Amino acid sequence: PVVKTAQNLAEVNGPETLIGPGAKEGTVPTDLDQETGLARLELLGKLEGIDVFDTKPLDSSRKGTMKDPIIIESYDDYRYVGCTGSPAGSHTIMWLKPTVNEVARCWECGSVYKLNPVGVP
Amino acid sequence: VHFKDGVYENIPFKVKGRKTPYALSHFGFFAIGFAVPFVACYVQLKK
Amino acid sequence: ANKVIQLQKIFQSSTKPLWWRHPRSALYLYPFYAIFAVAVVTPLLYIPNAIRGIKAKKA
Amino acid sequence: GRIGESWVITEGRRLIPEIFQWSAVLSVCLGWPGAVYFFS
Amino acid sequence: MVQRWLYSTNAKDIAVLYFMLAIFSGMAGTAMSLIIRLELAAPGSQYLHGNSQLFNVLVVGHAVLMIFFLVMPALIGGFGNYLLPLMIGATDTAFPRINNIAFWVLPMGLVCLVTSTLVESGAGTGWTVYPPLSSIQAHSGPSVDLAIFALHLTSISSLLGAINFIVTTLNMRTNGMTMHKLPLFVWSIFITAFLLLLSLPVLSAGITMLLLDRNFNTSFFEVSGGGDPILYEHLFWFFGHPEVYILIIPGFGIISHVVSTYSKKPVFGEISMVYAMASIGLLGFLVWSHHMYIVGLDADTRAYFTSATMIIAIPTGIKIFSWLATIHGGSIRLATPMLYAIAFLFLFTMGGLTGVALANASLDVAFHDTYYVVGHFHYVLSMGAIFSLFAGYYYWSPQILGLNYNEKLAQIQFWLIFIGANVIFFPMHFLGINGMPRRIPDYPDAFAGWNYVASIGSFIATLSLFLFIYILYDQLVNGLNNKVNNKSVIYNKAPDFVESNTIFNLNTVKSSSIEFLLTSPPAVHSFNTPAVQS
Amino acid sequence: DEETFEEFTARYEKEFDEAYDLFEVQRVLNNCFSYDLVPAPAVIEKALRAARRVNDLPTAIRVFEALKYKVENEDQYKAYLDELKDVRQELGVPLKEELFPS
Amino acid sequence: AQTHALSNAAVMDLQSRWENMPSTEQQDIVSKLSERQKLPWAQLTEPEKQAVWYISYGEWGPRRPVLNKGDSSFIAKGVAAGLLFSVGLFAVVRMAGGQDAKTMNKEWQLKSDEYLKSKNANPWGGYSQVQSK
Ligand code: HEA
Ligand code: HEA
Ligand SMILES: CCCCCCCCCCCCCCCCCC(=O)O[C@@H](COC(=O)CCCCCCCCCCCCCCC)COP(=O)(O)OC[C@H](O)CO
């Protein structure tokens, strides 16, 4: 049970461990330690850009054929994605299901997609 | 709160039970299907 | 303060339902909101019990 | 050829298959006047 | 274990619970409508000893119950909260507390309306509550107040649900999705929610005003005291007609989704009719007053109203022809969704034909309040709501449960409701031309045979409802058997003469969303990753 | 908007260059036959050789009976007869002598 | 693997039935057929062609249509049974209802129609026939 500097974007784990000391007199402090919960991490991330639950688009413009299939950065077993052409739109969207048990096909690109883990010990 | 696979538990009723193997509650549903108009008639008139 | 930390530690070391927050309020409300609720609900539909038994028969 | 086989069904949809459409509505005459005669 | 069915933070439990509530209300309404038609089977007092007060009490119960507790809750809530935030890629929908509050204020409405219907006086003015027809002098007791409270709470629930849907559409859109090319279901729900948000508050204000009149005994719409009930009449019209759109347009979106995912071809003029539906939603506030042609408005006002009411009628035919082209040039299967959609479209064409016949103002003088108007709206509302709900259930049951439903039982069910509807609704033309006088417990015995056939059709519908509940039991007890054998349909769409067996097996569905190949509803944490589309 | 149709054809040949299984043959055949265009003998022979790259005689039956029953096109027969005769004599796939006498 | 004159009992057993054979050598036979057709066609014999056409084309499994081997008769007779139940239940409930009309017999209607259709510019005497008993 010791105080944590929490100066690293990845060394903080557990909103319960963060409380936030108060102030006696002065002015309202900056949005670094006065915020409660884990919302301060999220607001810092949106302030800088490095974010969790990122809404940034994937390689939609890329064809993602067998030469270089698209990547998915998520450890979850299932996949909920789609790919129906390199441009913004050329046909009705059909979902793609990358998996390791079997292979996948696009029916317009014919791409075999490979799910992409994150490195583990 | 996150232990529902979603195959047979989505229904807001319990399949298990020897006294009610979906036989007593559903017979009550049968009864209440025609219960309200019958009692509405019975309050003021006869059926 | 000197009690928020203790309460948080107690909750962390003992996870129980009802939040262990309002025991006296619960005892004042729930048994009352049962007994008095019955006492205020039942007579309204028990007054016509004597009148109950209408077969819609007239002579 | 391109024109002779074009009128196999183009002009043939006015006298060949109209019986199907006529019978598709034949239920009214057999049903409702029959009920009228039965009751009255 | 009870928080799942009482404090459901997930949308699917609330959806299935709304479905159960709506189906219970619908079966009760169908049974009591059978009772009413039995009372109207033959003139006189055969089962009910006259009691025209009681007659109108059950008549208004019929109308109010089916309008407010069968068509509304499930048909919008389930499809919305199961598709609109799920297909867009959102992880979980917001505002669980709002939905729970709406659910828990509903039983207030149910109990209060039950008490209102089960008092000696009761309210029996029908779907129209315009004073002094709805005056407390004739319909005394607490019935009016309870009905008003139920109206208020149901309006609040629907408005909050529409707000949740709107904010989900506006904020929870995925990065890879254009707004102009949204699916027809999304735009349908968007237009329906906005029309509801612009319509329900007006009716709620009018109902609050009537409640104040009934409680504080003031003079706003009573004839004595210089009141104008026509204001509340116009408010009720500007509710109901947009409420008719609210009830129908999601059915249009559901039919569009069914035909798009079944016929394997795009809908003709998809973006053009998205724009047309947007125009309908924007212009619905101008054709709400084609029923008041006889109140005493000016001739020029009649001309304006009729001009609007047949100048906004083209998109109905546009949709008819667009879906006709959507089923044209493609493959149509002998499946229950195909036949449900075909029957719904055909009977909707007849209903719109009758409406166009009603569009003229000069003919309305001899046609208004005759049997033709009630026959027309019974046509449109009955087929629209009932067949849309039936098609949705028979098209979505394996999507939410995964347990197959018998094809034979579904087909015989369709045949029963279809033949009942046709035998009930065909003689209404003769009934209208003769002039059957509406809302009479003891009508003249001239229409005895037509009343008999209407009663036969109603009883056919009731035994069809018994078939519905027995089919539900059969599914619940033999879904495993249906999956094992071929007694039930296994795949939604049949393969074409281009596909090999293995290829079709590994390409069973090529639709516009992952819901079809989404596994049976997962735990409360689903769609953990955003949906990417290009 | 009467868009170009040879672009999809060139897509078919570029997927043939990337063809890796009979799945791509099925996809290109479905896409080509879905269009309103009647395939010329050149593209028909290209589809036939794509199907034969895996040497699957049932796919040959599929493509031949699809040519026989692709589009009504005001009931075009004689062109279909000569085209099937030549696309048969090029390799030889006698099958009409079996299913027809049924 | 490099077979010769592969025309055994399985080839003509395939055509008759497919679901009864217990799905554990279907993969074996289809793999053997694929290996055989990997070799040049050489105008394979007709039973093998028919078997491979059956296993690749359809009329089995997914291609099984909604139209089964006599379910349409079940549809029609379920509708007929529903109609019979409707008419029987209507008859029994009408019988249990009992008589509830002490007036408006046939003669009452005859008198009313004669009164209405005797004067006052009758439209060709009317057609108000008595309904029934
Ligand atoms: C929502 C629109 C709607 C619908 C669908 C219906 C349906 C029917 N209505 Fe009604 N009706 C009205 C709206 C509607 N009505 C209105 C506004 C009035 C006037 C009100 C008045 O002035 O007070 C009226 C009045 C009215 C009267 C006048 C009352 C009189 O004075 O006696 C009569 C007369 O018999 C009647 C009959 C019927 C019949 C036989 C049906 C049949 O179509 C019923 C068939 C319906 C079913 C098929 C339901 C099935 C039930 C299920 C279990 C659903 C299952 C679905 C799933 C959840 C999967 N209606
Ligand atoms: C499903 C909902 C629905 C639909 C689609 C319609 C469709 C229409 N309705 Fe109706 N209507 C109701 C629901 C509906 N109505 C209800 C509940 C009432 C009762 C309210 C009250 O009066 O109490 C009512 C009553 C009602 C009245 C009341 C009569 C009177 O004053 O008392 C009138 C009057 O004009 C009217 C008109 C129309 C018209 C013109 C259409 C048209 O939009 C129909 C559109 C369809 C067509 C266009 C035909 C098919 C297509 C074509 C053949 C294309 C070519 C034809 C033309 C463009 C001319 N409706
Ligand atoms: C007057 C008594 C009541 C009659 C009302 C019908 C009651 C139910 C049917 C009772 C039997 C009727 C006569 C049956 C003769 C032999 C036919 C037979 O074997 O039936 C089978 C052959 O099927 C048929 O072709 C008949 C369908 C069922 C019977 C239909 C009865 C219609 C009405 C008959 C009487 C009508 C009298 C008045 C005339 C209008 C039914 O198959 P299944 O449903 O068992 O198979 C499905 C599977 O096992 C489970 O999914």
Ligand SMILES: CCCCCCCCCCCCCCCCCC(=O)O[C@@H](COC(=O)CCCCCCCCCCCCCCC)COP(=O)(O)OC[C@H](O)CO
């Ligand atoms: C108090 C209980 C008394 C006994 C009630 C028994 C009811 C049994 C079912 C109905 C009578 C069947 C008599 C025997 C018929 C044998 C021929 C046959 O196959 O007909 C089947 C006919 O059954 C059906 O077709 C089932 C569906 C019938 C109804 C379909 C339409 C219903 C529409 C209205 C429903 C709602 C009605 C409400 C009002 C009543 C019955 O199959 P099973 O289960 O006897 O299997 C026989 C098989 O060959 C194995 O040996």
Ligand SMILES: CCCCCCCCCCCCCCCC(=O)OC[C@H](COP(=O)([O-])OCC[N+](C)(C)C)OC(=O)CCCCCCCCCCCCCCC
């Ligand atoms: C008088 C009041 C009572 C009026 C009603 C009285 C009761 C009903 C009387 C008519 C009954 C018609 C039954 C039609 C269904 C049927 O079973 O027809 C047989 C074929 C089946 O198809 P198949 O390919 O020939 O099947 C072969 C099966 N084997 C022989 C190998 C075992 O199927 C067909 O040929 C299908 C086409 C036949 C028509 C199908 C539509 C039926 C619904 C509409 C019926 C309208 C009314 C027709 C009769 C007037």
Ligand SMILES: [Cu+2]
């Ligand atoms: Cu309108």
